[PDB]
């Protein structure tokens, strides 16, 4: 039990709404992280569709995150991903 | 370098019922878990003047360790946990 949402342990962060979780049920949810550890995101694509010479390219994506000031900033529905 | 089947953390494909929406392109997720991750759906079930309550419901999502690169989709995101 933490004194406020901007100061939780581990930190609570909203992920930039440019990245959300899609669930087929497809509905899109904001992601709240509980950051028990860092994580990273890479976009990947198979560039050659070829059994004998298969190639993938990856690009790291910087994930902007927001600290919340009050529980008014928590949406009505969202997912929580708890790391570590 | 090792085959898909030799890497730690293992590459896990997440149930494609759960994908990452990026801006609305949606992407299958590959997880590499140095540490455990959990996923909960949250719903505010109460908002009075006094207090808020959120119901959290675990999603135990199906994952598969990949053994061949052929199991990899044409496009996907990789989420690596430290």
Contacts of B23 in chain A (CB under 8 A): 18
Strand partners, B64: B13
Residue the block writes with tokens 């898909």:
B4
Name residues 21-40 of chain A within 8 A of B (Cβ). 21-26, 28-29, 32, 36-40
Cα B11 off chain centre by: 11
d(CA B37, CA B9) in angstroms, rounded, equals: 13
Resolved by: X-ray
Contact between A24 and A8 (Cβ < 8 Å): no
The continuous run of DSSP H or E covering B81 comes out as strand B75-81
Contact between A41 and A60 (Cβ < 8 Å): yes
Radius of gyration of chain A (CA): 17
Contact between B72 and A42 (Cβ < 8 Å): no
Residue A10: Cβ-neighbour burial (10 angstroms; 0-12, 13-18, 19+) = middle
∠ CA(A78), CA(A72), CA(A7), 5° rounding? 90
């Amino acid at each position: 039990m933490d004194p406020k949402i901007s100061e939780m342990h581990p930190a609570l962060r909203l992920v930039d709404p440019q990245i959300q979780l899609a669930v087929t049920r497809p509905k899109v949810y904001p992601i709240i992280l509980r950051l028990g550890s860092p994580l990273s995101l890479n976009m990947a694509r198979k560039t050659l569709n070829s059994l004998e010479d298969k190639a993938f390219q990856l690009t790291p994506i910087a994930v902007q995150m927001t600290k919340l000031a009050t529980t008014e900033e928590l949406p009505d529905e969202f997912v929580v991903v708890t790391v570590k």
